[PDB]
């Protein structure tokens, strides 16, 4: 579901808010269109019809999401969802939460304001107000008149507003979507949706009834206002004290009510606003250039580059664009992020295997810079490495890259919390042909091991460059069968998670013997494959 | 393994702010009639004082309300009238047939009939309110 | 801009009779009317209102009905005392108008036809002595408002000075009564001596005289 | 529940007045009309106009837009002011309250008495008493009839009465009629038996307030 | 169907799609929609075209995506494009468009992925398993059912990207 992330966002939103319940509060009681109404109800017209604006709108709020996924169904097509990092997943739920909340709050004024106005209304009909209102609620008891007090039936003010709930539309469709409102939030309670799920997903499931009450609710224009056309006619401001007279003379006819126009929208404002100021928001988040910060050299063409940018959340796993408007006004290329978060800079390693970047050589000389542009961090994350117990990473070839980022921010957590760390050794196994242009990784391999030493720990350690074909190098083929036992027999209940980086012609022999090593029970070895899933 | 007591405990909060708001509506307004809109207001403060502790699951731990134990310190010396989710269920049904006299409070005694509907079906499966600490 | 009229201008009827008396309008008037009695004496008195309704006290006898422009008042058990003008009023339109209130109407009790009584009065001294001397012939008591009255002075016609003056119908028994005055100066009084009135009326046989001497008084 | 009002005697022509209405045990209060008439001497009634309690809503007849003025004062008095006054408005003028009775249909109840405006150029004179001779030597069936005649007076406040009111039978006040002078004269006469005018008390008594005449005289019978 | 093949050759595989007579239809009947709203029964002065021009923003917002995607094999140097109304509108300038472009010495694989709609069936499109350590999707977008059209495009980018 959609969110802003922003608290520039929330503030507009509330801003929005408090504007529309102001200017229809405003637009409800000043006219004198609205003022034998307004007499008889009090000032209950106004607190009983800006909630209702207000509400509108927040509820379109809370329904988007589904009109666009029916949208989606009826092109035939869908948008890639943006994917989950934990962070852009629960600050969505806040909104929904507080837009829900603003939802129940304007209900409740809207709901009190109206139970106010069935009493005086029902009271005027029976003899037990003062004259004028009396006066006024005893039309429409003729022909050619139209009535101003809905409550058409003298019964009693006890026991007549629950006469008026029942037999009169737009009172039962709001109980049974009171009621409605209330059970849904009710259901979504925490220790409710937390702990169980059979409950809230199915519970929640009143909004489809919630929403066709809300449709069916606003109907049938019972409150009623003075008519246009008779209103020049009738010279109110005149025409008011000769209360007992009305028809029986020419200058005061007998004034005609009518409804509300059935169509008007002049609510649409607020989800307008709210949609441009997110697009705005996001056209300044992403207008700053960014500036070079530390360019680095390596053996053979491994040119590094750390650059510092302005409102970005470099995350783990992903991979941005970089695009040089000197080499080429029309090109993005992807890199893959080799940082790790909470630090400034990218560090993105880019090799020359190609002419676009041998063109950050000859264009522009390491012996005053190209304006380099970064679109984003797209790419779907990768947590569960710092969400397990023991770990089983298995690098090769070309793809160690992606390592990089998770060994670089694995020690950062250490030195921070050190209690948040549930990781206790990385059986790295680096698997290539040579080490001819890699070099930038082995390095840092020897400055964590060694350098996390200082603190007397040697936990994961465990760097074990092998050799495949034509330092512990292997020489040969790295056998798996015997290899996870030794250290599987240490933690029982094993949930050693490998993460395989290759070709699927060696990925299915490591799942072959991983189902025949597991066994029945919260306590058996066994290591989970993520297949080609990270 | 689902029990209904949870949500019926917070049915019955609803319930029991929805009658307080009502009743002090209709007393503060003159309504006609406004001698239930002060039992209103007395039976929502009763069942809002009643069951404010969250009970306690019997399978792992709960979190609890703020100012947990200042009221289950209270509550817990009742062994057949609490701990018997029958009672809680017939003491709701009787609290909510005066207060629905009026069209204020009206949602009060439909709310809170189906907490008590909610809180015998817990009831018929078998549950305790097992104290929390 | 609104005309409002009486159709009758003058009803008679006898004791015992009816009288219906129609007021119309220029416009659809709904049924906003109010009959007013007038007696010669006294501010008019309400009679209905809203051209059916009662007013308090006044007896069942008088009923009013009409609707759109037409409306008529009857009235049942005519009797002494009753004799007096009617009028209709619009309480409809006030902002362009010029009456808003009829034209009204004579209604007088008839009777059976009465022989008026006749007196003569001579000047006294004063004003023989001070200008004009006046000599004055009284009619009482007779229905028939057409009486004629003719002076005449030493057995000749006399015109120019000559006013009458006839009261308004009693409420008691429907009769009326007249005097007529004839100013003379000091200059022929005395050349004069023998002056009467010649009483004509259709009650009587023939006109009546009173012979007077004046130097008498 | 009774009305009243006062304030207009002669005046010159061209001049300005104004009119005072006030009633007791009415409050002008609610929403009757207060609604003012008039008519002329011995003709049919005319509206002048005709205003509204509650409010300070005013209307007035096409005749007299402008020229004439209605107020409410002190919730219990209302005044008319005219302008510019001509030589028809020599008529009485009555102060009405329209009520609005149950339903909406409205009458003109609780009347007032009238108040004689004239407007002349002439000047008040004081009226004489000038006797009538009894019928002494003009007897009719043992009754006799006499009186008394008034020459000039001008506004018509006359009021005429037997002994002070005390004999109210027979009695026969005819209307004020015009002369060539411009005065107005009356005469008033009562029948009595033969009899009767051994009593002596026949007296003619006349008011004039404008001329603060009250000159009362006692008809003697004529012995010669 | 999820991509048209515009030329098969031993050299190139350019890839080619455009919106077809779902999208069209959607938008007539959105904008006929907003069009009725806005002046069969609109009464406010002033605000029918402001309804009349929210109505077509949604509507061309609403609508789908120019995609063309070329497979080259000399010099490799496999990339892609993806056009929106506004971007088809202003290259017809001839001017040019820029584009995502992935080196084809890296790309190992690729495997058909998968997308969730919650109500609405589900959604089919083409990765490509990059050596690097990340998946690029071929389109942006994914096409609900269809599993036939997408698993032959798999099949023939497969074959021509490596014989094995
Ligand atoms: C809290 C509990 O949340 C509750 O207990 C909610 C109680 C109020 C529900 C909404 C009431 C107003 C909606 C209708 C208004 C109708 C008003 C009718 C008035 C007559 C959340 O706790 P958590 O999630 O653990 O944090
Ligand atoms: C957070 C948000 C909470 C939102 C909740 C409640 C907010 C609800 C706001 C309702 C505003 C109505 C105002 C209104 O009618 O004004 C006046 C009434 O004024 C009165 O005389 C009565 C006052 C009653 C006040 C009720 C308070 C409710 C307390 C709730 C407690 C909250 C729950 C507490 C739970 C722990 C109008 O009268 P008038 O126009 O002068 O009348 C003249 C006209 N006639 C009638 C004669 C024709
Ligand atoms: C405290 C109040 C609430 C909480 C904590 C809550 C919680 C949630 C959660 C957890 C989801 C699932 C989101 C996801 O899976 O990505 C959700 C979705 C949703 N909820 Fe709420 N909710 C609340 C109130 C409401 C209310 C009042 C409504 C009224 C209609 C509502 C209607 C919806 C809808 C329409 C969705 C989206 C359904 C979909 O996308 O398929 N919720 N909410
Ligand atoms: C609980 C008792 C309620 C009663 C008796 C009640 C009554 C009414 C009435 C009489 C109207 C006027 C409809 C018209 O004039 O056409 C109205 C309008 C409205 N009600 Fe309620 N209401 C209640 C609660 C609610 C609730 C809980 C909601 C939640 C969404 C709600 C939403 C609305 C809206 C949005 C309108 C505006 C309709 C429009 O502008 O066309 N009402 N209500
Ligand atoms: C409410 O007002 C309408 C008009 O706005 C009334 O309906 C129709 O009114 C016309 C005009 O009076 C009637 O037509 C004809 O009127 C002529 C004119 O006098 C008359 O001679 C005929 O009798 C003829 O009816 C028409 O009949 C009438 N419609 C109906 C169905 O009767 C309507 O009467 C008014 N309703 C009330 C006052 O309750
Ligand atoms: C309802 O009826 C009232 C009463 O006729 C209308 O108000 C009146 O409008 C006129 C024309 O403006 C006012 O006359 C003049 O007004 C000016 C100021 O505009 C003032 O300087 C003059 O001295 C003169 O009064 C009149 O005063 C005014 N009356 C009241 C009570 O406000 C009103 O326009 C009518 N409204 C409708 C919708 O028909
Ligand atoms: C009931 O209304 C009538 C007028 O319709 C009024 O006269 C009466 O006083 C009212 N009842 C009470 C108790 O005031």
């Given at each position: 579901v959609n969110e802003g992330l922003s608290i520039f966002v929330i503030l507009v939103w509330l801003g929005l808010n408090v504007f529309l319940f102001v200017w229809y509060y405003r637009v409800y009681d000043i006219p004198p269109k609205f003022f034998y109404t307004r007499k008889l109800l009090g000032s209950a017209l106004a607190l009983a019809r800006a909630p209702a604006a207000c509400l509108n709108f927040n509820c379109m709020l809370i329904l988007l999401p589904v009109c666009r996924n029916l949208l989606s169904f009826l092109r035939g097509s869908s948008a890639c969802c943006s994917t989950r990092v934990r962070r852009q997943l629960d600050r969505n739920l806040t909104f929904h939460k507080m837009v829900a909340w603003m939802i129940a709050l304007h209900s409740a004024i809207h709901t009190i304001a109206?139970?106010?106005?069935?009493?005086?209304?029902?009271?005027?009909?029976?003899?037990?107000?003062?004259?004028?209102?009396?006066?006024?609620?005893?039309?429409?008891?003729?022909?050619?008149?139209?009535?101003?007090?809905?409550?058409?039936?003298?019964?009693?003010?006890?026991?007549?507003?629950?006469?008026?709930?029942?037999?009169?539309?737009?009172?039962?469709?709001?109980?049974?979507?009171?009621?409605?409102?209330?059970?849904?939030?009710?259901?979504?309670?925490?220790?409710?949706?937390?702990?169980?799920?059979?409950?809230?997903?199915?519970?929640?499931?009143?909004?489809?009834?919630?929403?066709?009450?809300?449709?069916?609710?606003?109907?049938?224009?019972?409150?009623?206002?003075?008519?246009?056309?008779?209103?020049?006619?009738?010279?109110?401001?005149?025409?008011?004290?000769?209360?007992?007279?009305?028809?029986?003379?020419?200058?005061?006819?007998?004034?005609?009510?009518?409804?509300?126009?059935?169509?008007?929208?002049?609510?649409?404002?607020?989800?307008?606003?709210?949609?441009?100021?997110?697009?705005?928001?996001?056209?300044?988040?992403?207008?700053?250039?960014?500036?070079?910060?530390?360019?680095?050299?390596?053996?053979?063409?491994?040119?590094?580059?750390?650059?510092?940018?302005?409102?970005?959340?470099?995350?783990?796993?992903?991979?941005?664009?970089?695009?040089?408007?000197?080499?080429?006004?029309?090109?993005?290329?992807?890199?893959?992020?080799?940082?790790?978060?909470?630090?400034?800079?990218?560090?993105?390693?880019?090799?020359?295997?190609?002419?676009?970047?041998?063109?950050?050589?000859?264009?522009?000389?390491?012996?005053?810079?190209?304006?380099?542009?970064?679109?984003?961090?797209?790419?779907?994350?990768?947590?569960?490495?710092?969400?397990?117990?023991?770990?089983?990473?298995?690098?090769?070839?070309?793809?160690?890259?992606?390592?990089?980022?998770?060994?670089?921010?694995?020690?950062?957590?250490?030195c921070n919390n050190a209690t948040n760390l549930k990781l206790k050794k990385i059986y790295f196994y680096w698997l290539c042909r040579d080490t001819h242009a890699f070099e930038w990784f082995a390095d840092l391999l020897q400055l964590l091991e060694s350098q996390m030493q200082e603190r007397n720990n040697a936990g994961f350690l465990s760097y074990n460059i092998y050799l495949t074909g034509w330092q512990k190098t292997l020489y040969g083929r790295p056998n798996w069968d015997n290899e996870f036992k030794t250290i599987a027999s240490q933690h029982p209940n094993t949930r050693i998670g490998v993460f395989l980086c290759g070709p699927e012609a060696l990925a299915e022999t490591l799942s072959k013997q991983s189902i025949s090593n597991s066994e029945s029970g919260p306590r058996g070895v066994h290591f989970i494959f993520n297949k080609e899933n990270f | 393994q689902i029990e209904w007591a949870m949500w019926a405990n917070e049915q019955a909060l609803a319930s029991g702010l929805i009658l307080i708001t009502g009743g002090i509506v209709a007393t503060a307004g003159r309504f006609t009639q406004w001698y239930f809109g002060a039992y209103s207001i007395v039976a929502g403060v009763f069942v809002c004082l009643l069951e404010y502790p969250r009970g306690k699951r019997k399978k792992g731990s709960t979190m609890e309300r703020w100012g947990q134990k200042y009221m289950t310190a209270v509550v817990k010396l009742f062994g057949p009238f609490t701990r018997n989710y029958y009672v809680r269920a017939v003491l709701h049904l009787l609290l909510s047939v005066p207060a629905g006299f009026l069209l204020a409070t009206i949602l009060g005694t439909a709310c809170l009939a189906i907490a008590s509907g909610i809180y015998l079906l817990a009831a018929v499966r078998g549950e305790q309110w097992t104290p929390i600490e | 801009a609104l005309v409002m009229t009486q159709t009758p201008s003058s009803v008679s009827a006898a004791v015992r009779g009816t009288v219906t008396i129609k007021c119309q309008a220029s416009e659809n008037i709904y049924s906003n009317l109010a009959w007013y009695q007038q007696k010669p004496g006294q501010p008019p008195k309400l009679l209905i209102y809203g051209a059916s309704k009662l007013a308090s006290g006044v007896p069942s006898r008088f009923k009013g009905s009409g609707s759109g422009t037409d409306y008529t008042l009857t009235i049942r058990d005519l009797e002494a005392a009753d004799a007096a003008t009617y009028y209709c009023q619009q309480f409809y339109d006030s902002l362009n108008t010029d009456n808003a209130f009829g034209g009204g109407t004579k209604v007088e009790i008839k009777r059976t036809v009465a022989a008026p009584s006749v007196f003569i009065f001579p000047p006294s001294d004063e004003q023989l002595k001070s200008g004009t001397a006046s000599v004055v012939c009284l009619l009482n008591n007779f229905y028939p408002r057409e009486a004629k009255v003719q002076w005449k002075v030493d057995n000749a016609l006399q015109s120019g000075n000559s006013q009458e003056s006839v009261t308004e119908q009693d409420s008691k028994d429907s009769t009326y009564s007249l005097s007529s005055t004839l100013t003379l100066s000091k200059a022929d009084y005395e050349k004069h001596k023998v002056y009467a009135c010649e009483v004509t009326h259709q009650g009587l046989s023939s006109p009546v005289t009173k012979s007077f001497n004046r130097g008498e008084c | 529940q009774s009305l009243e009002e006062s304030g207009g005697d002669l005046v010159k022509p061209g001049a300005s007045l104004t009119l005072t209405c006030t009633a007791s045990g009415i409050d002008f209060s609610g929403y009757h009309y207060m609604c003012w008439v008039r008519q002329a001497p011995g003709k049919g009634l005319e509206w002048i106009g005709c205003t509204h309690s509650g409010d300070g809503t005013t209307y007035y007849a096409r005749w007299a837009k402008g020229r004439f003025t209605i107020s409410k004062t002190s919730s219990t008095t209302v005044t008319l002011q005219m302008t510019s006054l001509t030589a028809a408005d020599t008529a009485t003028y009555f102060c009405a309250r329209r009520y609005v009775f149950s339903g909406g249909y409205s009458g003109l109840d609780s009347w007032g008495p009238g108040t004689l405006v004239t407007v002349s150029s002439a000047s008040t004179k004081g009226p004489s008493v000038f006797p009538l001779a009894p019928s002494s030597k003009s007897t009719s069936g043992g009754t006799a009839a006499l009186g008394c005649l008034v020459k000039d007076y001008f506004p018509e406040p006359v009021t005429v009465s037997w002994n002070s009111g005390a004999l109210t039978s027979g009695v026969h006040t005819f209307p004020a009629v015009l002369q060539s002078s411009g005065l107005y004269s009356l005469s008033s006469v009562v029948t009595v038996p033969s009899s009767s005018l051994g009593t002596q008390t026949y007296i003619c008594n006349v008011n004039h307030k404008p001329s603060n005449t009250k000159v009362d005289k006692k008809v003697e019978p004529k012995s010669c | 169907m999820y991509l048209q093949v515009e030329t098969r050759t031993s050299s190139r595989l350019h890839l080619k799609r455009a919106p077809g007579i779902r999208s069209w239809s959607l938008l007539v009947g959105i904008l006929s929609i907003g069009l009725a709203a806005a002046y069969y029964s609109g009464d406010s002065l002033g605000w029918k075209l402001f309804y009349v021009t929210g109505c077509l923003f949604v509507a061309v917002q609403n609508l789908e995506d120019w995609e063309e995607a070329i497979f080259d094999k000399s010099t490799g140097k496999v990339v892609l494009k993806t056009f929106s109304l506004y971007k088809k509108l202003l290259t017809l300038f001839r001017a040019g468009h820029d584009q995502v472009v992935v080196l084809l010495h890296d790309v190992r694989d690729v495997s058909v992925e998968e997308e969730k709609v919650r109500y609405f069936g589900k959604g089919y499109m083409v990765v490509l398993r990059l050596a690097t350590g990340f998946s690029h999707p071929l389109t942006q977008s994914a096409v609900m059912g269809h599993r036939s059209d997408v698993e032959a495009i798999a099949k023939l980018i497969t074959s021509f990207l490596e014989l094995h």
């Open positions: 109206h139970l106010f106005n069935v009493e005086w209304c029902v009271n005027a009909r029976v003899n037990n107000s003062d004259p004028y209102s009396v006066a006024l609620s005893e039309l429409g008891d003729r022909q050619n008149e139209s009535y101003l007090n809905f409550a058409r039936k003298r019964i009693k003010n006890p026991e007549g507003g629950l006469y008026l709930a029942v037999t009169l539309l737009a009172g039962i469709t709001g109980v049974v979507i009171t009621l409605c409102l209330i059970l849904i939030i009710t259901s979504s309670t925490k220790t409710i949706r937390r702990s169980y799920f059979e409950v809230f997903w199915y519970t929640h499931h009143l909004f489809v009834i919630f929403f066709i009450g809300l449709a069916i609710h606003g109907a049938e224009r019972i409150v009623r206002g003075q008519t246009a056309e008779s209103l020049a006619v009738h010279n109110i401001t005149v025409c008011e004290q000769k209360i007992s007279e009305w028809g029986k003379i020419k200058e005061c006819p007998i004034p005609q009510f009518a409804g509300n126009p059935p169509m008007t929208w002049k609510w649409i404002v607020g989800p307008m606003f709210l949609y441009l100021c997110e697009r705005l928001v996001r056209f300044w988040r992403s207008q700053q250039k960014v500036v070079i910060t530390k360019v680095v050299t390596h053996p053979f063409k491994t040119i590094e580059l750390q650059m510092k940018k302005k409102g970005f959340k470099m995350e783990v796993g992903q991979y941005i664009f970089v695009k040089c408007p000197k080499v080429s006004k029309l090109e993005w290329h992807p890199f893959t992020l080799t940082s790790a978060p909470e630090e400034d800079f990218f560090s993105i390693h880019i090799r020359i295997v190609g002419d676009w970047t041998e063109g950050l050589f000859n264009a522009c000389g390491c012996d005053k810079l190209p304006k380099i542009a970064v679109d984003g961090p797209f790419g779907t994350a990768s947590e569960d490495v710092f969400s397990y117990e023991v770990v089983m990473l298995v690098g090769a070839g070309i793809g160690v890259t992606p390592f990089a980022s998770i060994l670089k921010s694995v020690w950062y957590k250490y | - | - | - | -």
